[PDB]
Design a protein around this ligand. Sequence first.
Ligand code: HEM
Ligand code: HEM
Lengths: 727, 727
Amino acid sequence: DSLAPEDGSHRPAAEPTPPGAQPTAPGSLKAPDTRNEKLNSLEDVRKGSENYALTTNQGVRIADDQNSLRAGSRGPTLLEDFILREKITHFDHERIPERIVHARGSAAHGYFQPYKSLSDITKADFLSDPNKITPVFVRFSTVQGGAGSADTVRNIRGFATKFYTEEGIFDLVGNNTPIFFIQDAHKFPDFVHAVKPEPHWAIPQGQSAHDTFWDYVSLQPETLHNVMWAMSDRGIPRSYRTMEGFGIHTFRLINAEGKATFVRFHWKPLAGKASLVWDEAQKLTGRDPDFHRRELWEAIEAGDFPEYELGFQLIPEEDEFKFDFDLLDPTKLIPEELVPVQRVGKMVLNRNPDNFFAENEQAAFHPGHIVPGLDFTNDPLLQGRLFSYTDTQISRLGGPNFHEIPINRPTCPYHNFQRDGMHRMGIDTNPANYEPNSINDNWPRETPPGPKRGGFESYQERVEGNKVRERSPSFGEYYSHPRLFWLSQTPFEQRHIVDGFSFELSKVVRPYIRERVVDQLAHIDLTLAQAVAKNLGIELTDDQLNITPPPDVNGLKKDPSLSLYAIPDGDVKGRVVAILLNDEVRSADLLAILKALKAKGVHAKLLYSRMGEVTADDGTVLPIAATFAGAPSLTVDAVIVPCGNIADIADNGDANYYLMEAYKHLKPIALAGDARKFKATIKIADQGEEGIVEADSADGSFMDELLTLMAAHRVWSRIPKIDKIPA
Amino acid sequence: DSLAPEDGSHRPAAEPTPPGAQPTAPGSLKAPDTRNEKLNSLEDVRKGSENYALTTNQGVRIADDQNSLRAGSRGPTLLEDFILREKITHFDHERIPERIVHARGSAAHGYFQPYKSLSDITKADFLSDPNKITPVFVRFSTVQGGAGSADTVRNIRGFATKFYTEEGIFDLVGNNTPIFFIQDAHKFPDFVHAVKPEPHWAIPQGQSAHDTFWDYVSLQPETLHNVMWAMSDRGIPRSYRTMEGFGIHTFRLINAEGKATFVRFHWKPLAGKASLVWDEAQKLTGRDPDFHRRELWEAIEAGDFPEYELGFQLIPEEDEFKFDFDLLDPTKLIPEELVPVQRVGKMVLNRNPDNFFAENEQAAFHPGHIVPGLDFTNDPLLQGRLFSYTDTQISRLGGPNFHEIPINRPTCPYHNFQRDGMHRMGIDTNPANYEPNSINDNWPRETPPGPKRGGFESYQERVEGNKVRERSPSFGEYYSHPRLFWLSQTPFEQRHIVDGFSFELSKVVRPYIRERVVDQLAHIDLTLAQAVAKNLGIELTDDQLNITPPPDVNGLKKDPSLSLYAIPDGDVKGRVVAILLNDEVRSADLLAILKALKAKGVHAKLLYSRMGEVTADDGTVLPIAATFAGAPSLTVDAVIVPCGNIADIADNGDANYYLMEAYKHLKPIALAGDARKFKATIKIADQGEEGIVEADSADGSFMDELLTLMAAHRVWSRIPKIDKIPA
Ligand code: HEM
Ligand code: HEM
């Protein structure tokens, strides 16, 4: 019509900008200069808008997109209105089935590069040269809830990476913990049904805190290992940038000489590991159910590209049987103290999608998509997965041509004798649709395996045994890995695990199920079991108190790589601070605060009791990002209250509650000058407290001290003190 | 061999039980004796489980449902495992497309009956006989979010009723406000795309608080009336039992003589009208995203059957043009002060479904499904709806045989010459599949229209006009109905409206969009417009301050039926009270509390700082429903604190917070004996406060006071006091 504002302010800057500074936008508009081979290959299907006429799908220009055709301006709508019917038809058919699991997920484009050639252990082309760059598309997800459920639920997270290599798509489809719940794929519908909403009423969404889950767990101790991980703060990551990734299964690397090496895949977050606390996570599902999705997108728009290091645990074929646990058992992890992770390469996620539906929702990842240089093993969970991903994609994406949906296409050549199916895009000119043929001189042709550009040939593993439906006896140990995990956690991590079990079991309506789980905990660790029992009003029996603890794992009592926090890795870049304003802020404080944060790549949001602007002591006009209620402390990592007319907000219950919530969730707080008046709301003593930064002004060491706390993520020593505060 | 406990406590009693007393269960097992003709006819497809062997879908008993078939017990899974593949295949294909809108919804079975014969105004069979009962299935829903999004979002709500009548299915597909946002169906995809998650990043879920919605609103002032309703407390109902329903459009009733009467449909909740407050609603999306779903299912299990009264506004055909708005405009309401709602019948929802997916998810409602005695009008929104419901059901339910899906099936005869289509269940024996035919003597035959059991004939409305895509000039007024609604709300309801607009607009990133919406508000009411602007730090211009208020609606400056609360209608049956226990509770208090609650059908939840049991002063063992943190005050209507060992909980952070939250949210609080020591955390009054019930002991008088407060729902007089409290 001519509907935009004259200043051009409807349009975000096509340049990196902090979160909240500009409206977010399709990736190709936001970052037009950020390219890779896959992103370039999608140009053929990207559709613009500006300066084009509005048409039907058939290209007929529409004159009046405001009205149906009727007989009289108050008359009945006419069936001949093809423009109305095409328009409503498309709308009526917008939806496709969501993924059966991991329906909720958020995705981005990036690139991967190896640090050195891995030719000695694998002929995989994408790992053959440090100068070889592989486009990726990554989706992170929750597990149980639908595509419209909340982000910060307690759940395992999915971490799936599509590598568009020169010799084929390799999908690495992993999670954020190094084991899974179950051993054999045949049980996946039972486990998933147990954790998903219960079938009579479809409650609860996004939660394992209900009877059927804990019933199944109580009857299937193989689940306890991943359940320990889920109940720990691992189940509630601060963001996808701050969690680990794992392939879980042992796979094989195959080199040019035909040697097989056992491998488990790791992703290490270069930003470090960090999680929420449960009360914060749960509240955040209400205040911002899109928190992780938003955080991912805005990090990328800001330039805080999520980076991950790919690492391999490598085990020689001759060492297959050298551990207390079976390598093929996906409920067991391989302790880094026994087998180190060797760094392999770096993955950087640097561009958001243009259209979430077209790129994210239709993306299809499947762990059967491997490339020469890789192979499978007989892990019975993996073995069944290979069937499932292909099968489910045929309904979810509407037939067997899902690889022609643009996000899914290989960047490399694909030719074969497959034809037809729904939505077929490729128009084949081969005279032949079969081989062997003479009529096209047998093209396209098979290719023998070889060191590079060769055909896929399976590693010739020996198979010997009878056709059985039987769990290997080597898989029948359930408690030592849970115990190993438990003992590796810090005291505050352990408390969080106790609290997770305690909260979940309290939602289980049938008391005998709670009892049964507590009994299982008593096989893992008596201290764990006692603390959970106490929280449930349950008394362990003398028999339970006497259950002997499970054996160590190959002589390991603990392994600190299993803790989120035991070995600090605190990166502050990309984190965010709430600044609580008043109507006459000390402009000197604000210059110091904002500049110090910017120097470390830490973002800020200026909050007030209303939107608009406030004016500082010296006339500086300050734009307000959000209100105290609008952007609660849940959404930030720390809080700073500069000096000024504090009486303006000391009376504001919202401002006080802001600090009390941030205090309760162990976040750093800094109070400059008269802001120290807020000490009383949070019961801070005159002399002070570790984790509260206070000075006459925001000058000197004030910002370094606050940033030091932010590097340590949360203020764990504050835990005994929070029990009392009413928040 | 993993079995149930001794007590038979795995199983809920098949009798009415209060919420939390038993695990919930499928409706036919909870209430086996609750029947109606539809519930009975679903028996052909009900599938039991007890004492049956586990099988494949082909009926083959399975020996080992724990393992895949493999070559050796650590070997690869074999392709010949048909039991694994069937099981995984069915799992892989569980999902179907969710509804394009109203994807989130909760449904129940019930029955309808008219108070008297309406044969003088309509020949509809289901309204012909006060002793004739019609089975219903009802689905309530939100609009924007996916099937896994939260219940207590701010949204219009859907209220769809399927009447299984003797002369056909009639679907009355309404919402919880008497108007819609737009005038012509052609704009529906525009409006819906604007309110749905934005297409680049698919944020936000379940919220209109984002740029695209307020952009659309600001450019399409026809939306302002329903937006006013959405921003009021109507947008966050307490329960589906405590909101109104409306068909929105003018339809027709046709009697046996051929006379048309214009009609608008109403549902009146016999439990009264009640809504949440925003902070409570948003927090509840995090603590219990299934709150409404749960509340509906639990009410039904408890015998608090949702009841609604069907009501008609009736306008003679000769009065079509007699209002200062067009009857065919779905953005305009008909004020009850102009045309009263005539009572028509009662609907009672008295059984939950057996399987949520089978019966709720697959139900298909469509406002085109009418019956003889009803007809349409040229309302241009209704007219395009008629195209859309049939069409979307073809992809969502997999084909044209959706009426054969058990929940959708008529209970009355259906016979015609249609054949085939995916998943065809009916096996037709008619030698003929066309008419006219001689080979089957033309059966099934057309039936002339008439007074009863006749064929459908459209009312022969006169149509006169040219073929035009044009909005009727009579639709081009956008401000008077928003104003009428505004002036009819109480002062606290007006405040909440202002707060809704202010909260939403503050999340709009582009400031000019906020300014344009404030400009529209200035066309409705200057007080409204100024209060929002102030919250947004916007100053109205001189011209804005001089915008003439829109005219009254046919002389009305207010209509109190538009307010939720102006006219008392409170009903406490089915509400719930938190009782905060201590470790030595005064049984005399608890006896008097529970006796009084029980007499009015109010439920209780017993809460403590842990699970298990506490023993009262007289030896009564009290099982604990949930913890202070696990079932927050958000989920209850009022809180009572009995006396006993108060020292036990007086310094508990969660206990204090519980009262501070209930206080903030305007809920009645009752404190007995030493529990009065808690008056200090809610930091106000000592002679007492209207809204806080207090006495040395809990008695007849104490409970009467508390129950009177509960009848008035919330303590509006406390609003001035809550700004200060930090919760
Ligand atoms: C090691 C254990 C497993 C891991 C790490 C894992 C990981 C994942 C991830 C990350 C996704 C989402 C991919 C995306 O973002 O689109 C996914 C989806 C899926 N998973 Fe797995 N999964 C595991 C076990 C299984 C098993 C045993 C089965 C069945 C045999 C299975 C069947 C599926 C299916 C059907 C989907 C949806 C795929 C689609 O619609 O494209 N998963 N899983
Ligand atoms: C008066 C305005 C409207 C009202 C009261 C209304 C009400 C509803 C309700 C209550 C549902 C959910 C039924 C259920 O629970 O399954 C629904 C779904 C739906 N509505 Fe409407 N709606 C309106 C306007 C429109 C318009 C203008 C269109 C399109 C022209 C439309 C298209 C749809 C579609 C496609 C569905 C999904 C139906 C299905 O999948 O079965 N609605 N609507």
